[PDB]
Structure formats: structure tokens, C-alpha cells
Amino acid sequence: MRAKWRKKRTRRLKRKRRKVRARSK
Amino acid sequence: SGRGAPLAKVVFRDPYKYRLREEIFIANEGVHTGQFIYAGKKASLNVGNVLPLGSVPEGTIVSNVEEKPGDRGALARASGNYVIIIGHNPDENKTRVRLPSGAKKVISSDARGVIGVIAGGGRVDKPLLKAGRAFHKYRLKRNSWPKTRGVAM
Amino acid sequence: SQVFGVARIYASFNDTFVHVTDLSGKETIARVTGGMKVKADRDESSPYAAMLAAQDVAAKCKEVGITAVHVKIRATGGTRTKTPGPGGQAALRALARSGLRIGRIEDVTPVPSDSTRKKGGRRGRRL
Amino acid sequence: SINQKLALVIKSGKYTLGYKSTVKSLRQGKSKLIIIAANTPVLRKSELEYYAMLSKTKVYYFQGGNNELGTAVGKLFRVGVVSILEAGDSDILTTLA
Amino acid sequence: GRMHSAGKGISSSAIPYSRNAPAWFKLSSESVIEQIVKYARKGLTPSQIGVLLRDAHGVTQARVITGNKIMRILKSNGLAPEIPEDLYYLIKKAVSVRKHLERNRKDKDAKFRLILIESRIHRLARYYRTVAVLPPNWKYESATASALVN
Amino acid sequence: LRVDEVQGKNLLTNFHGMDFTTDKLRSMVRKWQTLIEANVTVKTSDDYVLRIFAIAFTRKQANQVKRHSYAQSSHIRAIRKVISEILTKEVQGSTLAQLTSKLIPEVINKEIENATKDIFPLQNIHVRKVKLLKQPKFDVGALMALHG
Amino acid sequence: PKKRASNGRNKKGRGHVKPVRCVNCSKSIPKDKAIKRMAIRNIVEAAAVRDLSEASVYPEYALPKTYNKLHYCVSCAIHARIVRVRSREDRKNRAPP
Amino acid sequence: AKRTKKVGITGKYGVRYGSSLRRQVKKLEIQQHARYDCSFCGKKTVKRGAAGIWTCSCCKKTVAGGAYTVSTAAAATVRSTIRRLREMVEA
Amino acid sequence: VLVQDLLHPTAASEARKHKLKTLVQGPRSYFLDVKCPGCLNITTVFSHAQTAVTCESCSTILCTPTGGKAKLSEGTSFRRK
RNA sequence: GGUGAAAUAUUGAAGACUAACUACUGCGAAAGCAUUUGCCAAGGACGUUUUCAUUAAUCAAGAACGAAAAUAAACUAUGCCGACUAGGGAUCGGGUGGUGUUUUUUUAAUGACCCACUCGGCACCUUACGAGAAAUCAAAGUCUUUGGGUUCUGGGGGGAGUAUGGUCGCAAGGCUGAAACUUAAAGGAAUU
């Protein structure tokens, strides 16, 4: 499997951790 | 005192004796004080000047348009909007013009129309923020605001 | 040297139309589409359906009077395949083996402006 | 170029940049060249043309205004009236003006 | 390498190997001196002054007539400019792209072209204050440069 | 043509257009050569209005080797404003009567061909598609000046 | 692997070439990155030339054609058009025959 | 130093209302505030008197215009076709 | 190739190269004492002149500005050097 | 209408491609940019016996621009500037000479074309003695007989463009950017 379509799914993991900055900061 | 786009109080030199009565037009994008704004079916197509739609070309954007010649004022009069003549049928004076939402109202060739747009574009292209200046605008309009939900009454 | 009049033969893909109008197109008489003797849909594109189509119009052209029907074959339709249909070829060959005379044969195939994007997509119709 | 020509009318020529200056220069009859701007008032432009006939001057209407005709006279302010009396010894006597 | 571009053009000047000559030139050193002061007193600048002597007159080059240059000749007579020839037409052309973007603000390439003109004009004034020929604290603000060069 | 007036089952017609076929334009236009589009508007003196067009093409020369060669832009600009000039001053007056008195005998085709022939000629260059759209009204007086 | 010089289809020192409109399926793909097959057939098939000049008027006329440039898309070019998948070096030389 | 950082003339509205809104605000905000150039006397005396009113601070030259700015995308497109077709009356 | 006197080359490959690609960057051009049959004063004109050269009294054309060598105007006595 | 297969026009509003023209060809920093006429300029090859005189080459940080919906499979997969080692038919634009072909108005002058040259590129092809794993490349050559200047980056492969923060933007989103722990294979060209 090509790491290009795979890197799309890892930016989705950072979207959930970004909404965590809001509830603490 | 109670509108959005200003008005050009064009006074006319009375051709029946030495008399000068001040008549009224709408706002025209860029018109100075003392502008020789000529009015006539035989007066050339210039911005701010007025005469018959059939006595002028297609694509021409006019304002204060009226379904009848001498109405002194009908459609295409709101702040910042315009009208465009998209058809000329010299058989039975018919000038097919387009309004702001997309209307095909074919009027007379002698129907009154002044070249130019209404001075006041981008008026709603800017949010007021403060409903207080919204209260300041109705100060010289009417009480059609504030509004409520019928689910509340 | 008889009774003239155009038609405007439209032969796109999968079907064909063979009607007759006057020297303008506004006053059209005897429509009869190419499929009143065939209930197959797909079998209306081959030279078989094209032969009986120029036959259903030739018998009625000798029942009223009109004989010359100008032939203007159409490829498909502007923003389309623009390729001469399977039955738009055997339509001219059909009026020959019947007895219909032509005033002049001309081509009026609408060419697309490489615009008005044709029904398909990036890869279009694939299987 | 037309900008280079008037560059020398400033490099030696004696012109009148102003309304009272062109009135004073013409009331004497030493000025023979004037250049009005098509952007500035035409009433101002017209009195110079009506006084051009009287002082016998050759008018020319340069493209732009006084802050544009001031750019040519080599300054940073505004002036749309160049009533030149003595030229800078060039072709600016009988050019396109 | 023609700096900011990729074009490797070799179209330049090829001065003769003859430092003396002509031998077929009438007049003298006085004539070229007075005729070069005449084109500087007209406002043609050494670039245009030197070219007009090439065909209108019989001046191939200044080294082929005197030991000084048209730049160093205007210096001696006192009919020289306040700034360099390339510096004058670089600010004059940086006014055309700056005032143009004022008539056409959505010029992405003309804004980048206006920037290369000025970026180049700053590398120029970088070595000009580095050689003491013009003011050392010279601030290049094309704002007053539009009504400065004209 | 266009319908005029009918007199006892004998109706005449007048010049109100001149369209073309697709095999005519698709035949003249080939690959490796240059094509030109020239738009122009001309009116008459009988309160009549019509629009004309003109498409230009290129050719070869004596002892030609290369099967190619394009234009240089400073060629197309000149030929465009030349065709418009001759037709806008030869169609005004006596409506389509004089308009057709120069288009059928091909005066325009031999005029532009020999004019720019001093440097770069160019062959074909016709009118292609031309159609009228605005007529005066009625009046049997003006409609009789053009009859046979 | 680096084996071909035109890689996809002719592209050297640019980066944005506009596409053509496919005939059969309507697939849009660059002019010089797809295929442009010009098919020259008649208003019929190709067998009754004697029958055409015996049903209509005037001798021969000029022989009219339905010549149109049918643009395809690499996909319909190797299926609905000429295929004959060629080898390594019988892939460089440019020529239709 | 400078009073703000990225809020400018819209800071007179504290933190009330919406962010994305007050942003587009600063836009035409400055386009009526800016002592724009008066295309008559060649001097910039153009002042926003009553949305569309642009007076000249000398001899009084009040000229028609746009609400906040003096002309946008639409107002420009129009004035170009009308002046070209204006000389098309004698052409 | 392999061996040749790059010092004394033939007048052949000498006039068939660029001015800066030659062994010495010299003027591969020339000059002309062209003049109009009415004035006795000859005007020294440059090959790729560009600027239109006039006479002492009456202003006339001698060479028309071109991309390279300013073409001659109809027919005037041109003398090289 | 359609799938392998059942189940016109008398005239015009508006915009697309700016059709065809439109290709191993052009211009632009890259991204990109397909008509046309005119204004507004600009930038480039060539042209130069015009001027200055090293003004400079390459570049952390910083600065302007950026398909499409600051980013790609944005790629010539190939850093820029400089030199030199290569021929050819080409081609684009420009320059020289040709009283040559030819234009018919009258040899003219000119002009187009044809011929070699030619610079700036755009490429491709045949060899490469060289280089390169090979494929291939006048560059990936002038690299163990190793050094013209210089920017940035990689060190088994994962983790990972992820954690952490920092930092830029109205925003998505980015920039930057680990570590532990894991295994002896991953990868490239070519070949059967």
C-alpha cells in the first residue's frame, strides 16, 4: 500500500487532538 | 432623511418664462455638483443623462425605469442596483430590459430611462454588527423591526 | 424539376429519424419515425431498420404528391460523438433502391466548440 | 518624448506656473506658449484660450492634471498652467503645442 | 549569468583591438569634446549621447578620440547629472510598474516584476553608498521617487 | 431569404441572410496552416441593418522545401482592418442591392489578395457566414424601388 | 523506471496543456496527451458511388464527405481505435504507417 | 509603539459580535475613511459625507459614488462599455 | 581536429563565427561615407546605425532603423569606411 | 434520451472552449498561460565601434507570486552561475552576405523564399572514448589521476510528516518535528 493515501488518515488523528486544545486551553 | 443611496435634486430651467423649479432623480455612480445633465430623446447617451430606451442601444444600463414615459419614477430605483436592455424590436415600440432578479419586462421605446447605476453599491456587502445603527436606520423609516418567533407567542 | 422541400435527417447513436419538411422546416408533413415496424430498440441502429424507414416515407410521398426531399444528414448532435450513425449511411442508400430523387446532397454535421462538456467525466463512460 | 521637451523649458526657460502669474505675464505680452490640463476646470482652461487669442499664444492640452503637469515641471506640488514667455532655445517654439 | 533570469544571452559590445585610430577622422579632440557637451546640454545622457556620435557624426568610441570617457567629459565641463544613467532609468521604470499596479492592482506578475526592478535597484544603491558617489543614508522609497526622478 | 408580400398565389422574397454548410468550413480548414476570424457591422440608407464576416487562410511559394511555417502576429492585425474598410463603404445606399453587386462577382476576394501581395499574399479569404436581422417596417413605396 | 523520453505524451518545459473532448465515452484528456484520429468516410458507407450519381441531379458534383476529427482518450485509442501494442525500440520512431 | 497588532480601527468594538465579520469590516471601513483622491482638483479632499457623497474640501465639490468605497467591480465594468459606446455615437 | 594552429587560422572559419566566439572580439561590421547627390558634405554612417542620420542643412534619411544593419534608403552613394 | 443488454427555424438572454486553428513548438520565476483588436507598460533572443566600471556569483532568516480544489504523480523525476569536452538534420525569434530563385509597376529599390553560417535556446537521434548498478545521460562528463564558487538535504527500513510544544493564517491546513520499542530485511535497475 502507498504511504500517500495513508498520510491522509494520520492528519485525521491530529484533528481530534486539536479539539483537545479548546477544552483545556 | 430616511434612505440608503442619496438623490440628485436636478433643477430644470422652466421653458415657459424665467422660472427654476427643482425636480428630483435618484443616485448616479459619480455625478459632480454643476454637471450639465441634459434630458431629451434627442440628447446623446451619456452617464447620468436620461432619454427613451428604444432611442438608445442594447446592453445600456439605466435606472429609475418606468413601464410608462413620464411616470417620473418606477422600477430600477433601489441603492446600488441596475437594469440592462437585452432586446430592441422597433415594431410597436418594444424595449425588452432585465431587472435585478431576472425579469423580461418588454416596455416602450419612448419609455423613460437614465444611464448609470444607483450610487450606493456594497451597502449590504458590509455587516452592521451593532443592531443599534439598525435601530438608527428605522429612526426615519417605519417599525417593521424588531421581529420575533410565533413559537414564542 | 418536380416538387422540392428539405427534411434534416437526424441520425445520432442507437436510433435514427427520417422525416420531411418544406424549404424552411416550419411546415413539416408526414413525420413517421424509424421504428414503427420494429419493437427491439437496440435493433434500430443497423442497416435493416434504415431500409424500411425510407420505404414508409416513399409510399406516402406518392400518395399526396411531394417527391424531392433535400437530404441534410446530421452526425449526432454538436457536443456529442459527432460520428455518422450506423443507420444514417444506409438511409441515403435506402432512398436510392426505392426511387426517391434528390435536388442536392449536402453535409450539416454540428461541430462542438471543445466546450459544453460532453456526458462523461474525467474518465467518462468506462466498463 | 513630450516629457523630455518640457524638461528643458524648466532647464533654462522662463514659464508662469499659476493663475495670477499667467495673467501678469500676458497683461505684459512676453508669454507666447501655454499648456492647460484636460483634468482641471475647463472654465480656467477657457479664460486662458480667450486670453491666448488676446495675448496671441499657442495652446496645447497635455494628458493628465496639475499634479501630473507638476510632475513634468519638476516639483512635488500641483500646477496645470505653464504660460512660457522665453523658451530654453529648442524646438519647443513650434512643436505639437 | 544575466542574474534573476535563465537566458544565457551573449549579445553585448565588441570594442575593436585598435586602441588608437581612426586616421580617417577629420576635426580633432576639441570637436568631440564640444559635440558631446552639446548632447549633454540637450539631455540625451552618455548612452544616447555616445550612440548619436556613432552614426550622425564619425565617433566610433571616446577612447578612439581622447583619453577620457563621455561620463568623465561631462564631469569636467559641469554639464553632468545628479545620479548614474542606469539608476535614473531603473527608478523611472520602477515608477511605471508601481503606478501601473495602481491602475491594475491584481497584477501578480507585474507586482513580482515591480519587485525585481526595486530588488535590483537596491543591490545597485548597495555598492553606490559603498563607493561614495551619492548620499550614504539614501532611503529608496519609490513613494517620493515618482516625483523625484521627474 | 425572407417572406415579403403575396399577390394572387405569387409571393416574392428579399435578401435577409447567406449561411454555409459544415463540409465547406471543415474542408478549407486543415492542420499545419493559419486561420483568421474578422468581425464587422455595416448599415444602409433605407433604415436597414445587417452583419458580415470574413475568414482568411495561407499558402506556399516558388521552390518550397519545408511542409510547414507559421505567421508572426504583425501580419494578422493588418489584413483584419483592411477587409472591414472596403465593405463598410460599398454597402451603404440602396440596401442589399449594392451589397450583392460586389460579393457574387468576387471584387473583395481579388482586392485583399493583391493588396497585401506586396509582402505576404494569403489565398481564399471569403465572407463565409453573413445574415441580416433588422428591416425598416412596411411601406409599399420603398419596397417597390427594388423589383424586377 | 526511466526507459522512455516523451514519458507520457510530449511535454518539455511547460506544465499545463488544455484537453480535447472524446467522441464515444466523452473522456476529457489533453490534446497532445491523448489521440486525434481524423476519419474520412462518405454520407453513406462506401460501395454505391454509381447509385448516387444516378438518383440525384448533375454529373458527380464534387463528392461530399463527413470528414470530422474524432478525439479519443488513450483508453478508446487502444480499444475503439488502432492498438497493435508495439515493442521497446519500435516505440521511438514517429510515423502513422 | 503601535496600539494594536491585527485589530486596527475595528478594536472600537471590543470582543462583541463575530470575528470573521469585523474582519471584512476593516476592508470598506478604511475605503471611506481614506482621504481618497478627488478626480477634479487633483488634490485628495474626498471625504465620506453620507454613503455615496464625496465632497471636495475646496470650493465644495460634492460628487456621487459608492456607499463606503467610491466604485467596486460592478460600478467599473459599466463606466467602461458606456464611454467606449459613447464615442460610438459619432463612429 | 587532433592538431591545428589556433594561432594562424584561415580567413574561412574567421568570417563565419560570432565577434566574441572569434580569437579577437573585433568589429565584423564597417562604416560608410554615404551622402545625397545635392550636398557636398559626406555623412559618416555606422552599419547597424538604427538612429536616422540627416545632413548639415536639409534633414534627410540615409539608413532606416532595422533589427540589425539599418537598410539603405532607395539609392544614395554609399562608400565603405 | 440509452447501456454489452433489458428497464428546424425568423431572433435572442448568458457563459463555457476561446472550437477547428493548437504541434516533442512558443512565452513566463515557478505555478502557469490556448481567439481577437486597442490602451498600458513591462520582460527576452538577437543587434551594437552606446554608457558605467566589478557594480558580482551562489544563498540560512526574512520578502512577492503561486494549478487545481502556497499545495501534486508542481517532475527536465535531474540545484543555480561559470568554463570547456559534440556532430547532425531540425525548429522558434533575431542578425550577416548572397545584383541567387522570384515579384511585374519598368531592370529598380525592396520584399518572400531557397542556401551555408549563426547566436539564444527547444528537443530528439547516432555513437560516448567518459560516466553510471544497469536503464540511461553532451550531462548523471572534466569524481581515488578524487578539490572553480556555492544553497539545501539524505545515512537500513518502520515509528513519521506522527508526540510535543513553538510558530504563520478569519479558517481547513501547514511549517517545524521527535522518541521509545520493533525486525534482517526494505529499496533500485536489469534479467530469467
* CATH number, residue C110: 3.30.420.80
- Touch D-H: 3+ C-beta pairs under 8 A: yes
Classify residue E82 as exposed, middle or buried by CB count within 10 Å of its CB (0-12, 13-18, 19+).
Answer: exposed
Question: Cell 559618416, residue?
Answer: I44
Read off φ and ψ for residue F108, nearest 5 degrees. -70, -40
State the angle between helix axes of D42-55 and D19-28 in degrees (0 to 180), rounded to the nearest 10. Answer: 10
Whether residues E85 and E122 fall in one domain: yes
Architecture of domain I1-81: Single Sheet (2.20)
Spatial neighbors of B18 by CB under 8 A, at least 6 apart, are none
Question: Cell 516625483, residue?
Answer: E147
Pick the residue of D17, D67, D79, D81 with the most H CBs within 10 A to test the interface with H by mutation.
Answer: D67
C111, HSE (Cβ side, Cα atoms, 13 Å): 16
Between CA C77 and CA C111 the distance in angstroms is: 8
Reported as type and span, the H/E element at residue D42 is helix D42-55
Between CA I19 and CA I8 the distance in angstroms is: 17
Between CA D2 and CA F57 the distance in angstroms is: 42
Q: Cell numbers at residue F70, please?
A: 507559421
C117, HSE (Cβ side, Cα atoms, 13 Å): 9
Contact status, residue C51 vs residue C114, Cβ threshold 8 Å: no
Domain assignment present for E9: no
C109 to chain F, any CB pair closer than 8 A? The answer is yes
Contact status, residue H36 vs residue H44, Cβ threshold 8 Å: yes
Closest to C57 measured CA to CA, from C89, C28, C14: C28
Whether residues E58 and E96 fall in one domain: no
Q: Domain span at residue C17?
A: 1-127
Contact status, residue E58 vs residue E116, Cβ threshold 8 Å: no
F23 to chain C, any CB pair closer than 8 A? The answer is yes
Q: Cell numbers at residue F48, please?
A: 436597414
Alpha-carbon separation of residue C40 from C16, C34, C48, C50, C52 (angstroms)? 14, 12, 12, 14, 14
Domain assignment present for E5: no
- The closest nt to F25, taking CA to C1', is J20
Q: Cell numbers at residue G80, please?
A: 475503439
Between CA C8 and CA F55 the distance in angstroms is: 26
Could you tell me which residues are beta bridge partners of residue I44? I33
Between CA B43 and CA B41 the distance in angstroms is: 6
User: At F37, is the secondary structure helix, strand, or coil?
Assistant: strand
Contact status, residue D31 vs residue D83, Cβ threshold 8 Å: yes
* Out of E42, E43, E147, closest to residue D71 by CB: E147
Spatial neighbors of I47 by CB under 8 A, at least 6 apart, are I29, I30, I31, I32, I69, I70
- Chain E neighbours among I 4-63 (CB < 8 Å)? 18-20, 24-28, 31, 43-46, 49-51, 53-54, 63
C23, HSE (Cβ side, Cα atoms, 13 Å): 8
The experimental method is cryo-EM
Could you tell me which residues are beta bridge partners of residue H54? H48, H63
Query: Resolution for this model in angstroms, one decimal place?
Result: 4.2
- CATH no. of D1-97: 3.30.1330.30
Classify residue B95 as exposed, middle or buried by CB count within 10 Å of its CB (0-12, 13-18, 19+).
Answer: buried
Indicate the DSSP class of residue G33. G
Between CA B58 and CA B141 the distance in angstroms is: 36
Contact status, residue C73 vs residue C107, Cβ threshold 8 Å: yes
Between CA F65 and CA I63 the distance in angstroms is: 33
Read off φ and ψ for residue E54, nearest 5 degrees. -65, -50
Alpha-carbon separation of residue H61 from B76, E38, H30, H46 (angstroms)? 27, 49, 21, 9
Work out whether the CA dihedral B16, B19, B21, B25 comes out positive or negative.
Answer: positive
Between CA F11 and CA F3 the distance in angstroms is: 8
* Out of D8, D11, D71, closest to residue E150 by CB: D71
Distance, Å, G18 CA → J99 C1': 50
Closest to G27 measured CA to CA, from C124, C116, C127: C124
Alpha-helix residue ranges (DSSP H) falling in C6-84: 47-58, 61-64
Is the backbone of residue C58 left (phi > 0), alpha (psi -120 to 50) or beta?
alpha
Between CA E104 and CA C8 the distance in angstroms is: 51
Q: Domain span at residue E123?
A: 81-150
Complete DSSP assignment for chain E? --TTS-----------S-SS--SS--S-HHHHHHHHHHHHTTT-HHHHHHHHHHHTSS-S-STTT-SS-HHHHHHHHT---SS-HHHHHHHHHHHHHHHHTTT-TT-HHHHHHHHHHHHHHHHHHHHHTTTTSS-TT----HHHHTTT--
G67 to chain F, any CB pair closer than 8 A? The answer is yes
Whether residues E90 and E150 fall in one domain: yes
Classify residue F2 as exposed, middle or buried by CB count within 10 Å of its CB (0-12, 13-18, 19+).
Answer: exposed
- Chain H neighbours among D 31-90 (CB < 8 Å)? 37, 39-41, 65-68, 78, 80
D13 to chain H, any CB pair closer than 8 A? The answer is no
Between CA C41 and CA C23 the distance in angstroms is: 31
Domain count, chain C: 1
State the angle between helix axes of E108-128 and E85-100 in degrees (0 to 180), rounded to the nearest 10. Answer: 150
Contact status, residue G34 vs residue G77, Cβ threshold 8 Å: yes
Contact status, residue B63 vs residue B36, Cβ threshold 8 Å: no
Between CA C72 and CA C20 the distance in angstroms is: 11
Contact status, residue G39 vs residue G53, Cβ threshold 8 Å: no
Q: Cell numbers at residue E90, please?
A: 531603473
Written as one letter, the residue type at E73 is I
Between CA B93 and CA B109 the distance in angstroms is: 4
- Using a CB cutoff of 8 Å and minimum separation of 24, what contacts does F112-116 make? F112/F56, F112/F79, F112/F82, F112/F83, F112/F86, F115/F82, F116/F78, F116/F79, F116/F82
Q: What is the dihedral of CA C11, C16, C20, C26, to 10 degrees?
A: -70
G6, HSE (Cβ side, Cα atoms, 13 Å): 9
Between CA C5 and CA C27 the distance in angstroms is: 10
Written as one letter, the residue type at B140 is L
Between CA A11 and CA E139 the distance in angstroms is: 47
E21 to chain I, any CB pair closer than 8 A? The answer is no
Q: How far is CA G73 from the centre of its chain?
A: 10
Is the backbone of residue D17 left (phi > 0), alpha (psi -120 to 50) or beta?
beta
Whether residues E96 and E75 fall in one domain: no
The number of beta carbons lying within 10 Å of the beta carbon of residue F31 is 7
Work out whether the CA dihedral E29, E34, E37, E42 comes out positive or negative.
Answer: negative
Strand pairing report for D61-62 and D36-37? parallel
Domain segments of chain G as ranges: 1-97
Q: Give the fold, CATH level 3, of G1-97.
A: first zn-finger domain of poly(adp-ribose) polymerase-1 (3.30.1740)
Spatial neighbors of H44 by CB under 8 A, at least 6 apart, are H35, H36, H37, H38
Between CA H46 and CA H57 the distance in angstroms is: 7
Between CA H67 and CA I9 the distance in angstroms is: 79
Single out the residue in E61, E80, E99 at which a domain terminates: E80
Domain count, chain E: 2
Strands of the F35-43 sheet, one edge to the other: F35-43, F49-57, F131-134
Read off φ and ψ for residue C51, nearest 5 degrees. -70, -50
Domain segments of chain D as ranges: 1-97
Complete DSSP assignment for B107-142? E-SS-EEEES--S-TTSSSS----THHHHHHHTTS-
Alpha-carbon separation of residue C58 from C2, C19, C39, C61, C95 (angstroms)? 15, 11, 21, 5, 8
Contact status, residue C47 vs residue C86, Cβ threshold 8 Å: yes
Contact list in F for residue B90 (CB cut-off 8 A) is: 134, 137
Distance, first Cα to last Cα, chain G: 29
B54 to chain H, any CB pair closer than 8 A? The answer is no
Q: How far is CA D29 from the centre of its chain?
A: 15
CA B105-B107-B109 angle, to 5 degrees, is 145
Contact status, residue B144 vs residue B26, Cβ threshold 8 Å: no
Distance from CA of B151 to the nearest CA of F (A): 60
